[PDB]
Amino acid sequence: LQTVIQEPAMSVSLGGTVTLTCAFSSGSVTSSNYPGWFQQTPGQPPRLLIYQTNSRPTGVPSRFSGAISGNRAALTITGAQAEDEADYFCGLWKSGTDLPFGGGTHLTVL
Amino acid sequence: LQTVIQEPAMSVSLGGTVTLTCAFSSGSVTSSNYPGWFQQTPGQPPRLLIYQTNSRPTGVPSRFSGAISGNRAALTITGAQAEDEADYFCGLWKSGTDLPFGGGTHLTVL
Amino acid sequence: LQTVIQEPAMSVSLGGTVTLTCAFSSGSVTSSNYPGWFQQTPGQPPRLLIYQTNSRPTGVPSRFSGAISGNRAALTITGAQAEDEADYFCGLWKSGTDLPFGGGTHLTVL
Amino acid sequence: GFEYNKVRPHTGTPTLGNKLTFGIPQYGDFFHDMVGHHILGACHSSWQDAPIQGTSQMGAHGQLQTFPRNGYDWDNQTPLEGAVYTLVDPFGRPIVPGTKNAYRNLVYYCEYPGERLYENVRFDVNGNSLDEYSSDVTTLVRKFCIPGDKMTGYKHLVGQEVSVEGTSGPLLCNIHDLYLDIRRNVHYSCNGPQTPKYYQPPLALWIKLRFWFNENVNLAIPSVSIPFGERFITIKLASQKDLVNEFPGLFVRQSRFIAGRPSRRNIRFKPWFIPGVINEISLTNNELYINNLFVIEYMFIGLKPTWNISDQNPHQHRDWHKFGHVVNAIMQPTHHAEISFQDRDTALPDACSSISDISPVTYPITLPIIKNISVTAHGINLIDKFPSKFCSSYIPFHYGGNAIKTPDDPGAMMITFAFYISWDTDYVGSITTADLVVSA
Amino acid sequence: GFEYNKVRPHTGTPTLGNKLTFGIPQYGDFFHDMVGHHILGACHSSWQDAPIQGTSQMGAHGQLQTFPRNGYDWDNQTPLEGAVYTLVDPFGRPIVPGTKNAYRNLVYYCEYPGERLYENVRFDVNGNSLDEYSSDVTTLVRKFCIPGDKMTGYKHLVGQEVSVEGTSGPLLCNIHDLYLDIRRNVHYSCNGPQTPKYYQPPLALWIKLRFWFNENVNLAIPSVSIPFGERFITIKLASQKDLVNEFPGLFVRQSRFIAGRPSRRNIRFKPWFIPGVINEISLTNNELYINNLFVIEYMFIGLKPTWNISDQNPHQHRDWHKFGHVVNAIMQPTHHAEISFQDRDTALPDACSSISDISPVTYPITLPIIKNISVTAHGINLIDKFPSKFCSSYIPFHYGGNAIKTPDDPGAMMITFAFYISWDTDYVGSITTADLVVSA
Amino acid sequence: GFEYNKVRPHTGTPTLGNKLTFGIPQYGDFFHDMVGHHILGACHSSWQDAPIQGTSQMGAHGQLQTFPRNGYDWDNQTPLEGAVYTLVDPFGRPIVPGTKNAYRNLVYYCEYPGERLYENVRFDVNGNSLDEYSSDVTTLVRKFCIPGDKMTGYKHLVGQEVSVEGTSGPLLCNIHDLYLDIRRNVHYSCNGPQTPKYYQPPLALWIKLRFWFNENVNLAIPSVSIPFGERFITIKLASQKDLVNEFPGLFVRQSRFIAGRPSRRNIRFKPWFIPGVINEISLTNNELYINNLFVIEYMFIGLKPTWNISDQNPHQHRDWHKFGHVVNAIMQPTHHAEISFQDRDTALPDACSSISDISPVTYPITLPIIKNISVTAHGINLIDKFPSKFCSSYIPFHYGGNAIKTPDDPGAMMITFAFYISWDTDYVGSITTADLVVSA
Amino acid sequence: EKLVESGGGLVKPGGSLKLSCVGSGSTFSSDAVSWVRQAPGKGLEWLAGIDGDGYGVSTYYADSVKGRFTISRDNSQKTAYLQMNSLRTDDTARYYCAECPMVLLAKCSMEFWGPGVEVVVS
Amino acid sequence: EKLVESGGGLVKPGGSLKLSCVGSGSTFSSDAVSWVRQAPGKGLEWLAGIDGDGYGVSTYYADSVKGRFTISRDNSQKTAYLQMNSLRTDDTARYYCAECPMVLLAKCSMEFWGPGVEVVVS
Amino acid sequence: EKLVESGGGLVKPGGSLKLSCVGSGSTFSSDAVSWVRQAPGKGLEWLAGIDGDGYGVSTYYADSVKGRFTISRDNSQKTAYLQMNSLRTDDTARYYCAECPMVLLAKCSMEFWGPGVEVVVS
């Protein structure tokens, strides 16, 4: 079935560059799926960082970037900080009536 | 006085053609009096069949017709049925503020 | 200071012509001060007679006139009557945010 | 030396639709040009009665006029939700139904009424008609041989209206370049005989007579060439019903309220046109200004559908002279507005309104009816299957010089030589033909 | 060979309303045509004060402008229910009453300002004026003897504006025949000197001098036939008050609420026109271009009312050249809307609105002032009792050839011969006469 | 005697953007004028997809088209209180976002497409080109030497649309004099190839070839003076992208609600223009009509900015021929309405509304780019520092006679003699020059 | 477009009564209302009627009841009222409404009818 | 266009009071309201005033009462309010409204007047 | 543009519940609302959503909840409702709204979120 696959967890050094990936089980992710990325600090509602793979809502720093690499959706954080330690979610719009999310990847800033 | 007269009663054979008449006491009926014909099944409110001597409201069969013959107002029923057993009224618009009705003619379908 | 000066009292014979005057303490009255004249029969609210030095509201007789003579504001009553015995007030619009009235002149018709 | 003296009608008290005769006297050694002066009288229509709601009557041109009841469509049979019908003037002034002598129709004239008047002109010399033309050759000569610099005077002589220009107040504009400015708008209007009016004032018409010797001052024939008593001019005046026409004086106003969100109000109009009677028009001051001086290579062809001049045409007064297939494009401008009554939910307006105008805007569009034209001869084919626009446009544009103007209608064709007109046509119907052989 | 030399004014620093002199030198063996070049400077009005509610002041032409109180009509004496009055610009921008230096009037020019400038032209040879014409012969010349193809250039030379055409987006139409289509709308606009503007940029005027030898290249007089020092050209320039005029820069906005059902809101406007001061206009680059080449049967008559040029005429700048009686027709377009707030009773709208524009649309309509004209002779009656339209329209249309254009005014008449002008009028007032005898 | 034969293309099946050749045969003793007949095929655009809210995409000419989110301005970054964005057709018909194959762009032509087609014309005799001109001298020819009476035919031949006049119903007017009347309004419309349409029908073009011997019937060169097999005509047809252009087929509709008193609703529109693909246009019935007869003192100069014809110009199709600096003025008419819901306090309206139109009204305004022009000679300085309006307007107005028409554009100049053009310019950029030396 | 009558009942002679007619149509405010009565064993007799919105609203009456009856309208609640004063013993009949699909009442249609209410005077 | 005033009565020194003025005109929302007082045996003295709708609404005060008085308007109910704080023993007078037939108060005429209310401080 | 959720609490198995979401934005009536749940220790799962005014309003559902859940809108009070029928023991989670800045819900962004309410089934 069409399900979303991510890495379970990742790590990064403070001030480094780290890229998270999001993929389908069988298909190929393109720009017509409109992937979105969400951040959820513990105890708080999810916060939107990237929509349509490149656009940033007002109030989000410029160190977050998104793109489509090969057949996957990639989110790049350059110059990590202490606050960035949280969970990241990938939302893929397959078809026009279903929005399956991802497993959720915990990011650790050493 | 300008009073409206018609035959007290009429008879017809089933499936036949019968014509009822309506007239003034002294004047002459023309198309400017806008005669109307009403039917009243006993126990029911009157139902309008012919207005302006030629037109039929929606829901009235085409076997009813109306016309002006000489100086008389005539309603013709062609192909009578059992349900037509009822009373018929003629209403004439003399002047612009008077609508004297008729005596009422009972139609007998043998 | 800019204060309004009027005659303490005046007198007139019945049917005569009498002119009341109103002036500034130091300045000069012009047409840009828009003087107004008010009449107050005792026990009643003040009533407006002349506004903008020349115009009369509807309901005021034509025997009241107003003008600017030299550097003073003059109200002329021609053909005095018995009812005219009352107090007269002159109101001058100095600047654009202050309306200092007058002391009030009592007119006696002998 | 030239003196313009007058000649009186020989018949006596002419009427609209009967033969008229002038007798030419020998006053000067030559005569140059002929001008007929007429004064058509005033016009108006008769009073009529307002209808009663629910009435259907038989209108003009086989059209059924109706005044529908409340809650029904324009056909008085199909139900409609909230239609309400009242009566109005063409200017929006209300009328109460049933009132006796409540309204009058408006009257207007034909286009170029000074050209339809002379339906047939003959120059007779004891019989033996030297020349004879109709009201179709005149249309060709005005569409081809009139310079266009002198069109205002011609349109004044034959009683054709001209538009007047007007301006508005200053307005602001935002200029762009790859700024602000003040500009004015320019509008046009008309007030002539062709505008529908309640009362048409008397109309003065001057009509020039075109015989082969009247073209040039050096070609005018003498008055002594042929015996004195034999010269006569005969004219068959057009009928009254081919000159004036009527415009509706009563309109039915429909107002419809559509429930929901947004709730909507629509206002539309429909004419109630029942023909009336126009009084008899009398010709006065009928004079002929005979002028007394004191001592092939071109063909114009017009192909006119018979629908243009038929009495059953609702627009025959407009289209009686056009050479082509005429259709109509109708624009209906509307005032639109939306209003919201609160600030809780404002995605959609709470109310809307659409207001129409009483009468629409109509554009006459003329289209060609000929794809190929050939004028063969017993010798050879001559013109053979040439396209329409080659004869219509290119030939006048190249040949002719400043004398020949390029026409506007797609049906007026010109062919140069130094007689069997066949054509290929996608239009079904009768076709009239007009010819004019001239040399220049 | 030919080149254009320049001649400087002899008087020195001309002004508007004073005599001006050029001295012709003998440079070439002939002179053919003469053109005067002038550059009028910028214009604007002075700052003014905003009024106070209830004020009445005497304006131009003995008209009383008023700013009515609340609840009164436009005369400040007759009660009205719910009138409320405010102040606005011509573009709707509000103005606070009593503000010092709050607004300026707008300034515009006359129509054809390059023709009114030369109010009198004289050619002198030690006195003994060989020729002399006014600013009335020039109007006849432009109305008769200008081809019409060459009118864009002429209107550019004398500083008269020309309209510019624009288009809109595509629109849908429904066709009828006895179908859908896409069409466009065409509009016109003006931006020239005659459009009221806050600031009028400098205006360059070229004016051609017309003497009997300037008509043809073969008829130009030599520069040696007359002694060198006696040639002079004298021109009496028109005053500044006859060239520029003002347009209101302040408007009074009336808003009225009429209670009942439907409740109505009406908005109307009225000018507050009090004259100001326009700065002095200075002429610069005053030059005369002399061409240096190197080696009766017609009369135009204009009948002009004295009201056209009278200083008390509010529209003299528009009508200073028209030969006829000029009236004005005013259109006031309005936006209308109707709204219903509920669905219980919907026979009548719950609210209405009608919004007017700040300025109306004005059409100038010219009417004739002559019914019969006769130019008698000491020997015979000559032209006797001919109708007006015979001389105004038919004579130019027939006679003249391509040289003579058919005029547009009902007062411009033309008569052919191969001197006592009397007329019959229904018009009471003074009438001016202009003549120009030419042979062709 | 003369008849029009046919000549077929020598190359075979021409295309738009490639050389084309005709071979001149010796059929008659003289050949006088040549006409090229072509039939361009139908046109349309490809289907496109509707956008998703929040999308930004690079459009034509480096312009970014965006579909903003709710509550943001047209740049999708700056907050706005109550903006709501939807999608509509050019005629107001809604479109659902995300739909595949939902809309098409509209297609239109250039102005005078029959003049841009022949980008280069050469008449060769075994090489040795006797004559050669471009699509620039043709513009000068039409702006100067075409009489103006024959503009309708010329604009029909080269496929330029012509406006059609329509009228409205009668309207009431109030006359003033120092009374009521009935008047009509006059409007204009267009339906030709230049109106954006979904489907453009086939277009027939006639183009006249102009060589020095084609001017007069007496000057046509013989067909025997030159050997039979050496005569050829070469034409470089213009490309497809220089003849057809596209108009947006999808619009973004913004609705904004402003809270307060009065509460206001505003509706505005913005194009969403993304280029598509137009099918290949094919030329058919390519023929050459040759007429077989059987037995310096002037110069026009055009100063055209390179911006007019550059591919980056969004308005190059309109302005490819104008001689001047073109700016644009935009009218945006609006329907305004005010409503009050009660009668307690009515000083200010309770609600307002202003409805805009989908597409605005655009006026092209042409301005001069030259202040002084001098055409010096190796012998003498000749023309020196003359003002622009002197050469543009006065010289055509005076010299030329009825042949030379006074131009309209400020950049078309004319100078008379019986070759180094320098100018003074306040405009920064490249300037193109065109010349045409003719003797009359 | 239907109609419902109410307010009819036994009335002592010399009294006054009010009859109400409620409509549920989409054009009740633009329709002419009328009141008709039928004595037992007799023919219909027309009594009174009112106009509809669009022109000047007016009330018309017969000759045998003018001055005793009064017809009124209420478009907000979609209701028509008839007030009868000085009822006589010869008024025992049945009263119907009649709404035409027309604005004015002169020469009307009288298409729609209500069931009616039986009024007795004794 | 008349006016009715209320809210006046005996006030202990140092207190505060509110006076209400109710208008019944057709243009009350477009008219400038003002408050005038008159001590017994003296002349009129102007106190405060407010503007009318159509421009920016603003409140103007005299010099002897600025900071102690406050004038307010309520167009929905057709009312004008005056709030007086820290009343002194020298304020016993009679207070009238004055409805201008004008939008702006600056250089008004003050045609209309109310009967007045007797405010006493003791 | 913020959101407030209410109506969540302990629910016995087999029951039904209704959750309400109140918005206080300037374009709530033109925005697509959606409901998203998150089981403890798991990832987000989208449940249902509705469109906004401007086109035809329609409701879309997932595959695991179609037929049991129903989403409704009320623009007059600025409110969205979710009705849940036949709740199972595997529905204990936290439910958030997500107001889109868009008219249609298909392929949206879901910028705005609410704090959420803890629905428990046991």
UniProtKB/TrEMBL annotation, chains D, E, F:
It holds the Pfam family Capsid_NCLDV. SUPFAM superfamilies: Group II dsDNA viruses VP (SSF49749). The gene is p72. It is found in: Virion. It comes from African swine fever virus (ASFV). GO terms for molecular function: structural molecule activity. Residues 296-440 form the Major capsid protein C-terminal domain. GO terms for cellular component: viral capsid. Keywords: Capsid protein, Virion. InterPro entries: MCP_C, MCP_C_sf, VP_dsDNA_II. This is B646L. Its main location: virion.
